[PDB]
Design a protein around this nucleic acid. Structure first.
Ligand SMILES: [K+]
Ligand SMILES: [K+]
Ligand SMILES: [K+]
Ligand SMILES: [K+]
Ligand SMILES: [Mg+2]
Ligand SMILES: [Mg+2]
Ligand SMILES: [Mg+2]
Ligand SMILES: [Mg+2]
Ligand SMILES: [Mg+2]
Ligand SMILES: [Mg+2]
Ligand SMILES: [Mg+2]
Ligand SMILES: [Mg+2]
Ligand SMILES: [Mg+2]
Ligand SMILES: [Mg+2]
Ligand SMILES: [Mg+2]
Ligand SMILES: [Mg+2]
Ligand SMILES: [Mg+2]
Ligand SMILES: [Mg+2]
Lengths: 91, 151, 210
RNA sequence: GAAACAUCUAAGUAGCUAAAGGAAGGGAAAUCAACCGAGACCCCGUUAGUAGCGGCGAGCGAGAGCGGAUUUGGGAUUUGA
RNA sequence: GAGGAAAUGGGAAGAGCGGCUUAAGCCAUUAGGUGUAGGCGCUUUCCAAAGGUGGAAUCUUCUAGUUCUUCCUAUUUGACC
């Protein structure tokens, strides 16, 4: 019928501003991957903060200790943090 | 009965008030009584055609000697924004009016405005303000006066 | 060479390091495959940095989190220690009101104020005088330390245009605009402040219950 | 290109066609802001690879404000009655 | 006859200043000088967001960086041929 997905589609087509067809920026700037943005946050330490996986569903699969453990935020491993450091994620 | 009938602020009227119609009466009102309706009439005269310095100087002295030096300071601010040339003797009465009511910080503010306008005062006034700042516990303002008197 | 500056003997502090021209003979050490090894994709130069080999990457196996607040307010933090040091340096007048304009002119505030000044409690053991402040926010330790010496802190409200008119009043007179008027706080910001700021910079404080 | 591919990208690009001028187009708010205010239109810098869009993947990517260049508004339109 | 150019990032060596530095532009070119808009730091550390925020040392106190040049690499462009 009228669910939240098509309600949001009808709302976004009419009220959200539209992307320009062509660019205006003449300078070339570096862009990293768009999947970094909502998932990672750089700290002033120099390490990058992340959140652990497995908390979306399937909570009957996990032990109590693992359920308590996945609540705790963690850090990106170094070999993967160097890539986003080199691709201008930490500014 | 002229000012309550807003005759000055009428556009279709042609004959305006002569300079001699307000030049002595502002002097008399400021020197021998109240300054408030004098400044009300002259602020109405600004809204049509008048920026005479004589009535402004007399309003400054009248507001100083009445007992409200804030009005003298704001009229000097009006002169500064309108570009009216500012004298040295006007700030002396403002400084000593601040002095007489026990506000040496306001006196130092007015002294700074006088110096930024470009008038050097005398060492007698310097000696008055430095002792008044020191005896009120405001040591650092007195030291800031000392800086410019050294310079 | 007695103070001689000729164009025949100019040289730098260290000798210039030149380019590594790859692909020349055997003796240069970087010829015949340069530095690329033998065959593959990294020798043909068609490899993108950050690719992981077909495994699902770490940037896609981890969950997203949270939302972005577009109305977030940023206040510049000043500690009591810097203000006390500048008091002892004779650059801030201790007997007048300490506004935000005073801090911006002395340089305790950086180049870009954004939404106001937050007063911090660092170096609180250097405060020996009754000081009067007018900031945007203040922490519990800073307010306690100031009022234990006998001063007062007033949390005061400016908006963006009011902050521009407080800090740069010459910017309006170069543009030909009149000085604006201080706006009232919005109802979500009403509880966070005490009073509306005066747009000329005030130099006499206002006691609370006096 | 997405290490395949179908929404997406390449891209309103290449190409084909029509009309007009030395320039064309746009233009003086049924415009932005936020209870404080700005004041037509086009071009250059910054905001900013940020907000936003997106098999929320690969990718695409503003506006307002602020600093410059040019600086311009005219008409309906005013009324003695 | 085949590792090269620009712009933006990660670093190393050298230098300027002590907060550092301009972009478009403007005034002159037998040639430079100006231009504060902006960027980074000081700065405050957790946090989805609201919210919240005592560095060290005791003994004349320590408490920050930024902009260029050269070279090695990365991204976008045909990208060693
Ligand atoms: K392929
Ligand atoms: K295929
Ligand atoms: K570089
Ligand atoms: K350095
Ligand atoms: Mg497009
Ligand atoms: Mg070898
Ligand atoms: Mg060979
Ligand atoms: Mg190699
Ligand atoms: Mg290989
Ligand atoms: Mg081979
Ligand atoms: Mg092989
Ligand atoms: Mg493909
Ligand atoms: Mg398209
Ligand atoms: Mg075409
Ligand atoms: Mg023609
Ligand atoms: Mg034309
Ligand atoms: Mg209005
Ligand atoms: Mg403009």
């Amino acid at each position: 019928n009228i669910t939240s997905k098509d309600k949001m589609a009808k709302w976004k087509k009419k009220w959200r501003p539209r992307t320009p067809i062509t660019s205006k920026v003449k300078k070339v700037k570096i862009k990293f991957y768009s999947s970094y943005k909502d998932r990672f946050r750089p700290l002033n330490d120099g390490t990058i903060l992340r959140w652990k996986e497995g908390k979306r569903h399937n909570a009957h699969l996990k032990s109590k200790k693992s359920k308590r453990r996945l609540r705790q935020p963690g850090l990106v491993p170094p070999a993967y943090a160097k890539v986003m450091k080199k691709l201008n994620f930490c500014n | 009965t002229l000012i309550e009938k807003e005759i000055i602020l009428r556009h279709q009227d042609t004959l305006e008030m002569e300079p001699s119609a307000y030049n002595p009466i502002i002097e008399y009102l400021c020197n021998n009584g109240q300054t408030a309706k004098a400044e009300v009439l002259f602020r109405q005269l600004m809204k049509r055609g008048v920026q005479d310095q004589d009535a402004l100087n007399n309003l400054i002295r009248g507001h100083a000697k009445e007992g409200n030096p804030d009005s003298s300071y704001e009229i000097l601010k009006i002169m500064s924004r309108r570009g009216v040339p500012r004298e040295s003797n006007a700030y002396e009465l403002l400084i000593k009016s601040y002095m007489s009511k026990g506000e040496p910080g306001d006196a130092k503010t007015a002294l700074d405005s006088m110096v930024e306008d470009g008038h050097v005062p005398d060492s007698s006034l310097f000696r008055s303000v430095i002792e008044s700042l020191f005896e009120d516990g405001r040591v650092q303002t007195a030291s800031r006066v000392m800086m410019i008197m050294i310079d | 060479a007695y103070s001689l500056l000729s164009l025949n003997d100019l040289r730098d502090n260290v000798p210039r390091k030149l380019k590594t021209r790859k692909g020349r003979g055997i003796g240069s050490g970087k010829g015949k495959t340069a530095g690329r090894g033998h065959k593959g994709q990294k020798a043909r130069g068609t490899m993108k940095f950050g690719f992981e080999g077909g495994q699902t990457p770490l940037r896609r196996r981890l969950p997203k989190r949270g939302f972005k607040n577009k109305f977030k307010l940023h206040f510049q933090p000043v500690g009591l220690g810097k203000i006390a040091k500048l008091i002892n340096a004779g650059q801030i007048d201790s007997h007048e009101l300490i506004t935000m304009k005073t801090l911006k002119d002395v340089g305790a505030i950086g180049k870009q104020i954004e939404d106001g000044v937050r007063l911090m409690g660092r170096g609180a053991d250097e405060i020996k005088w009754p000081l009067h402040f007018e900031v945007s926010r203040v922490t519990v330790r800073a307010k306690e330390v100031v009022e234990a010496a006998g001063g007062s802190v007033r949390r005061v409200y400016y908006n963006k245009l009011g902050l521009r008119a407080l800090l740069k009043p010459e910017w309006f007179e170069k543009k030909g605009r009149l000085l604006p008027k201080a706006a009232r706080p919005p109802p979500k910001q009403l509880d966070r402040v005490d009073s509306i700021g005066r747009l000329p910079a005030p130099k006499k404080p206002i006691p609370f219950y006096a």
